[PDB]
RNA sequence: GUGGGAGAGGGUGGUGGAAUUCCCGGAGUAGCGGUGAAAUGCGCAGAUACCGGGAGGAACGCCGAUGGCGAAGGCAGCCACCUGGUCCACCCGUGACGCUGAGGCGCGAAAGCGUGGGGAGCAAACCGGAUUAGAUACCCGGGUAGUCCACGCCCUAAACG
RNA sequence: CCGAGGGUAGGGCCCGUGACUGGGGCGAAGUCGUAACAAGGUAGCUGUACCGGAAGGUGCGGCUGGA
RNA sequence: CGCGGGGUGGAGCAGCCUGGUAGCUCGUCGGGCUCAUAACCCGAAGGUCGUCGGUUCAAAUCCGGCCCCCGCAACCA
RNA sequence: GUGGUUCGUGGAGCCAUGGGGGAAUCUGGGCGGACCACCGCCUAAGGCUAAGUACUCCGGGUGACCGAUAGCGCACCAGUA
RNA sequence: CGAGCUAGCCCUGGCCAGGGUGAAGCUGGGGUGAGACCCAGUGGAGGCCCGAACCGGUGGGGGAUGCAAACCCCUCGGAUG
RNA sequence: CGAAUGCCGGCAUGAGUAACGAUAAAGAGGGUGAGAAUCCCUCUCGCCGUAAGCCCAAGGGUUCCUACGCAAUGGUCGUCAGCGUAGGGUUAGGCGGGACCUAAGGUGAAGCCGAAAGGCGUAGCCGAAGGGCAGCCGGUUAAUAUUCCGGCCCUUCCCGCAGGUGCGAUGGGGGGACGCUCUAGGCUAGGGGGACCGGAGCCAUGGACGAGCCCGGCCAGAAGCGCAGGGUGGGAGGUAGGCAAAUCCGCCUCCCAACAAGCUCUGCGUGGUGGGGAAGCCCGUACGGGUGACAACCCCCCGAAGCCAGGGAGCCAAGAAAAGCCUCUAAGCACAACCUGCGGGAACCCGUACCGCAAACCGACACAGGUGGGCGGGUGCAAGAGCACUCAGGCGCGCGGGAGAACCCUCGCCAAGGAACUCUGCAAGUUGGCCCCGUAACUUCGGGAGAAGGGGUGCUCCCUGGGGUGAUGAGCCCCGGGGAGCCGCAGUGAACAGGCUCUGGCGACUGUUUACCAAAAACACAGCUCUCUGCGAACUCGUAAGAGGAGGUAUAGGGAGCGACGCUUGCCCGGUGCCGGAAGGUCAAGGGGAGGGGUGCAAGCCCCGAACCGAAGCCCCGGUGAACGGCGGCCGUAACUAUAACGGUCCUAAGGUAGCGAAAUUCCUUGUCGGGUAAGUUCCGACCUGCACGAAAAGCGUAACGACCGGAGCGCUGUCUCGGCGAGGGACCCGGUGAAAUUGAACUGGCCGUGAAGAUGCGGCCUACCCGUGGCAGGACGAAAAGACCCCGUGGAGCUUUACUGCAGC
RNA sequence: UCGAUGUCGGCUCGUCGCAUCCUGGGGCUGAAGAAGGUCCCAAGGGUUGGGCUGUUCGCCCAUUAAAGCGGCACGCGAGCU
């Protein structure tokens, strides 16, 4: 989708909005299973650690289910599909037959009315979740766990997905939304299908405000400030850095790798 | 234009208050000295009810 | 209308094997590439050649024809779904309902453009090496757009019988 | 009231003209190269695309007006 | 005015700093191939080293003065 | 690897120690300025211990100390206005 | 010792007269094989417009031992973000 | 002590000088008094009136009210006061806050961390104009009143009775509970009108005894009614979820409802009763009282932004928590308890005066400044909180009186010309609201547009079309149309209200910024690209714990640059960086000990110490430019000259492509052409010899946007030729109060000289009676700041880097 | 002169020198006349308005009897810009 606009105001011409057709007549969220008071704040205890944040629409947290072995075997019916301000993926709310309700990040396909479930059993269909081993090599899938019982963590962004590649001992090779081939443990669930609402990468914010709404204040270039507060700074009419591009704190930012070398997680990785 | 003193009872006891100064090691010393110097008033005289 | 036939006709989903390129393991050395001849290039930091495994893209050998299908552009591994055209027999139905067709509208190879994806091979531009008087060329070693996918454009041709 | 015309303001079409600029035509015997016609010494032509003093080259698909 | 770099056969350039030996490419000239020109092949010629001085046994070379050439600098007022 | 001592890496002991290694109970151990021999001196890895010493919020005494711009900031309801 | 000024952010409240312009979307008609689309009418969008409050502070003049250690007069920017 | 721009103090000079704090404005009569422009009173005048009037909150803290007072405070005066002395004055179960709840954030048992101090920290606790919660209208005081009094109406507790039910928690669930914009229906606040009702009165000056003028025609109010409107399905089975249990909630599955029919729940009317009730006139105030009065207290119309409220619709940026409340059960308990009515009793603490857009708050001041919320009438102007006037109400700004100079400020007008002004149309003018005609290039189809340029606008009469409220009508109120006619110079007749256009530069745009000299072309900005990061992420803060990132997960997060959009962004990887290289070379501690030394009679003890094994880094091999960067010189050549498509050569890592170009870049330079002008160092269009453009420190464009910057024209004008007159506030004179920086002392002239080189002071000459007042600024190298430039000091700071040396960090 | 002598130009206001631009007087002329040339005397008065540039200065445009050169802290900011 992606709503468009006629130019009746510069900016609201290039501006592009999402299409909330996929939003089952829902909107008002569900008390109980979410929401919780969401403590918004751009800095830690005192100081500001991440810069340029703050401001932007008030938000309510939708406490989603990111570990599904909670209900192994208990099937549930997908009730609605709603908007979640805390993420890029739309989320689906679903009523188990157990009578319990919980939200799930909604996969592309999954339609309201559908029945979905989790566990070793589970049929390989959009929405169902199973330990990685039991999933057919090659099938795509989202909401992966990295270590058994620790909760989902990979491919959860709007319309992202990972594809299974092979098996190898108690591990199974994956291919993350980034292109890295990772070795994940067999016992990590991963609900099947891709995340959906993949038009998300196409929304043209539009104006200055639009960014402000999502809580992101203006970002000033180092080049603009002085030597006192950033490498690229001073002296006359602009300047060409004058040294290898660096961050406010001073480490190179055009090429310098960061992953800490001797990490134990190294051996389970294979790509880029 | 607007100036720098905008009186506020709450802020004043809340900041230069007595329990305020007792709470920290530096403030307790603030008291010591003032006590040791004589000062009729150890801390500002906030008021009302 | 009835009952049959052939076909790379069209769209969608899926799938198979050969080969190339890369990665990993093995084993193995002093050269491999390349050309008119060469050089650039690659190779003891272990290349080429050989075996094993894995990844990925694109194109479908034999069948294949001087064959088939389409209005053209064009269409080729295999499977299923949706779908167009068309030939024969039977002479059952309508009953002149026909032909062409300014304009309109649709389709329209390759290259090109937008947005996103993909990128193995190839390859404008570009970089080298030779050739030459010179080479902004032909030849050789690299190589990016593009070539592939989806959606939206562009409307050209020796779009030729 | 209408009304010749005059006034003011803004448009439409056409003609003339202009520093300088673009390509074209024409003009016996100036320069550079050799693209095409013989297999033209890289078959040629082509739509498109990028590049080059120049003819032109190269990519992609195409045509026989070549084999 | 100040600073430092450069003048070498017809053309463009080496050769000096560690003085004695001027080299490269093109061009020029004679011959060859060609029907002829070029390309190409074989042979040959060509430099008071910007000038006036001395330094040495010996100066393109080292050291002073002018002669043009090029490049830089000329700020704070 | 450092701190302490006069000792600033010096021939650098001694006394403390963060790190690593890691004993013995008198024929046991430490020290006398690297080290070794000899000759000697002490007996580490537990603790306490008056007095002699420092100070002056406070009381008292005395001044070749001041005498209201001095002397405490304040002789006076001053850490006040 | 200070964020009772100023800067940013967090939590919780409040304010923005009245005028313009008229987006999507609806509905009707037209169109087609179905569409695209085109007409009206409806609709009430927007860091849209005029303009107070309010937030500013463009130009000029005055003030310059001032009314004022940043003011006054005329003029002017924004004013649903 | 004579100097230190010395320190403390005192008193001079400037000087009766400047001032006396908004140009809203005063005049008189009568009081009081020792003394009145300044205090009280009355009359007249003027100013505010989306306030300069009322009501809260903050802050202040007696300023409140009253009596007696003027030394000081008051910019004058003062009999007055916000001043001095004294006395009085602030009354709550229902207002606000607390014996209620939670927010950010604090604090913090458990726990974690830190040399000490301390730092973190889920529970809990604290924390509020947010949630919850029971009082409305009058009357009284010199001063308090939702507090006292009257009327009417409520809330909790505790104890009884009376009757109902399994009652029962800090535990489960429900609810509370939530955005922005736009909105309907019905109400209310508030306002307009009345031939009706009620009122003292009044006919003036030519007319009017009139459906005349003037004034007023309400307020609260339980239950019950009515009218609006908000909430809500009712059964029954089954259950494995809501961290124990539930009959509750949730999820299934059958029924009857789909309606607000019914239950409740608010709001508004009406309501027993309770109150208020003008002008005017009489009074004595410093003000209130009396009468009007048995006051009347009725009918229309406009109507909210407020009420019903959790109403509705649309949109994306997706919009607190906890308690009260309802329900559910657990322990326990069911002679308890809880629910419902009825009584009786109990109901604490703190605030309460006054100021409150300001003389009581923040600005040293009775300071032209700053200060949050609510009410804010009428008429007219299209509307409105605009503007003009004016209700209620409040003021005339705590020095006056004269004068009628220069000059200044603010204002008004002007013959002829009109930008000649000037750096610049700076300033000022012109234009201006509404309605209707009519509007170009260009363009991202929105725009450009209020383009431009025009016409209309008052009042009177006639005819006539729509609504709204009332019944389908009168009225009352909104919108319209047509035709005659009247008057002035002029009809948005006053006030509020764009001058327009053409063409360049920069930046896309709305925004943002140097609080107090820069608002911009600077920053930001959507968007583009590069790079890091697989999640206990990178990064940041922190010694740590910890947190932010993020309750996010590659369509995500960090960093860098570029900066809408269009067309595009060439070549160089030699040097620097970063990226990739289980080979080499170097390389520290450590391992290793060939060999050597010191002492021992010796076993020994203690030292050095070569091979060799030894990381990262560097070296080295490769890559990489939307990484730091860089992107040539000299000669010759065409059949007129000229120029050079062509060639030679030298050196690079490669030798700037497209596009643009005398530029926000051009030194020479007012380059040379062309355009605008009578005339053009600027401006626009070209050429290219680009001192010294050039492609994400982006390149060249670009509609729209701009308090940005340049050039031009129209319109208009006191900018100007070139001034003139007029207004007011000062200036001046008089009475009252009365500063200042400055100051070696002064009895302080011109000239030509001279002097440390610029003399009132020295020489010579000239001039010159003593002292002021308004004026002008040439001078006293005039005042003001121990020059902000420059240099100096082995002075200081901020900043940089392949300066040195360290440290964090890796 | 740095315990401060405000600095270009413009404006306003002047004033002074003469090595005179004009007007007045004069000599020589290769002075027929008219108009010039050149020098001598002479400062009494006069010595324009515009375009461009911050400009001084210049170059223009239109005129004039002429469109003089200099000084006064590149005269004059307790006079202005
Ligand atoms: N008519 C020819 C048109 O112009 C071009 O041709 C033009 C040029 O290429 C051509 O130039 C030629 C040159 O090619 C050739 N190699 C040398 C010759 N001297 C030149 O000649 C030219 O100049 C000379 C003297 O002035 C004249 O007399 C002659 O007419 C003229 N053609 O002269 C032509 C104009 O006259 C295109 N090549 C051709 O395809 C096109 O159709
Ligand atoms: Mg909640
Ligand atoms: Mg912190
Ligand atoms: Mg803290
Ligand atoms: Mg930025
Ligand atoms: Mg800066
Ligand atoms: Mg720095
Ligand atoms: Mg820099
Ligand atoms: Mg610069
Ligand atoms: Mg038949
Ligand atoms: Mg046909
Ligand atoms: Mg096509
Ligand atoms: Mg194609
Ligand atoms: Mg994009
Ligand atoms: Mg290839
Ligand atoms: Mg050849
Ligand atoms: Mg090739
Ligand atoms: Mg054909
Ligand atoms: Mg023309
Ligand atoms: Mg040929
Ligand atoms: Mg050929
Ligand atoms: Mg050819
Ligand atoms: Mg081609
Ligand atoms: Mg090519
Ligand atoms: Mg030491
Ligand atoms: Mg000893
Ligand atoms: Mg010894
Ligand atoms: Mg001893
Ligand atoms: Mg012992
Ligand atoms: Mg002791
Ligand atoms: Mg004495
Ligand atoms: Mg004293
Ligand atoms: Mg005395
Ligand atoms: Mg003292
Ligand atoms: Mg519409
Ligand atoms: Mg609107
Ligand atoms: Mg706006
Ligand atoms: Mg506005
Ligand atoms: Mg002395
Ligand atoms: Mg004194
Ligand atoms: Mg005086
Ligand atoms: Mg005076
Ligand atoms: Mg005076
Ligand atoms: Mg006053
Ligand atoms: Mg008035
Ligand atoms: Mg008092
Ligand atoms: Mg009083
Ligand atoms: Mg009195
Ligand atoms: Mg007085
Ligand atoms: Mg005063
Ligand atoms: Mg008296
Ligand atoms: Mg008093
Ligand atoms: Mg409490
Ligand atoms: Mg109590
Ligand atoms: Mg807490
Ligand atoms: Mg704490
Ligand atoms: Mg609490
Ligand atoms: Mg509260
Ligand atoms: Mg209350
Ligand atoms: Mg009162
Ligand atoms: Mg119960
Ligand atoms: Mg409960
Ligand atoms: Mg609850
Ligand atoms: Mg009469
Ligand atoms: Mg009532
Ligand atoms: Mg349970
Ligand atoms: Mg009365
Ligand atoms: Mg609602
Ligand atoms: Mg609680
Ligand atoms: Mg009170
Ligand atoms: Mg009160
Ligand atoms: Mg107020
Ligand atoms: Mg006053
Ligand atoms: Mg005031
Ligand atoms: Mg205000
Ligand atoms: Mg009102
Ligand atoms: Mg109006
Ligand atoms: Mg007003
Ligand atoms: Mg005039
Ligand atoms: Mg006139
Ligand atoms: Mg005119
Ligand atoms: Mg002018
Ligand atoms: Mg002038
Ligand atoms: Mg201008
Ligand atoms: Mg102006
Ligand atoms: Mg412009
Ligand atoms: Mg302009
Ligand atoms: Mg801008
Ligand atoms: Mg500001
Ligand atoms: Mg400023
Ligand atoms: Mg601005
Ligand atoms: Mg400013
Ligand atoms: Mg964390
Ligand atoms: Mg988080
Ligand atoms: Mg990023
Ligand atoms: Mg920039
Ligand atoms: Mg910029
Ligand atoms: Mg580039
Ligand atoms: Mg490079
Ligand atoms: Mg390299
Ligand atoms: Mg490199
Ligand atoms: Mg490396
Ligand atoms: Mg190494
Ligand atoms: Mg140029
Ligand atoms: Mg330049
Ligand atoms: Mg001209
Ligand atoms: Mg002009
Ligand atoms: Mg010109
Ligand atoms: Mg540039
Ligand atoms: Mg760049
Ligand atoms: Mg730019
Ligand atoms: Mg702006
Ligand atoms: Mg004037
Ligand atoms: Mg006057
Ligand atoms: Mg006087
Ligand atoms: Mg003198
Ligand atoms: Mg004397
Ligand atoms: Mg004298
Ligand atoms: Mg003077
Ligand atoms: Mg001075
Ligand atoms: Mg000094
Ligand atoms: Mg300087
Ligand atoms: Mg030194
Ligand atoms: Mg000086
Ligand atoms: Mg002095
Ligand atoms: Mg003379
Ligand atoms: Mg003469
Ligand atoms: Mg003069
Ligand atoms: Mg001078
Ligand atoms: Mg000058
Ligand atoms: Mg001067
Ligand atoms: Mg001045
Ligand atoms: Mg002076």
Coordinates of C-alpha atoms (C1' of nucleotides) and ligand atoms in Angstrom, one line a residue, chain D residues 36 40-44, ligand 21:
Chain D
rA36 C1' 32.4 2.6 -45.9
rG40 C1' 37.4 -3.2 -47.3
rG41 C1' 41.8 -6.1 -44.2
rU42 C1' 37.2 -6.0 -37.0
rA43 C1' 31.0 -8.6 -42.5
rG44 C1' 27.9 -4.5 -42.7
Ligands
LIG21 MG1 35.7 -3.3 -41.6

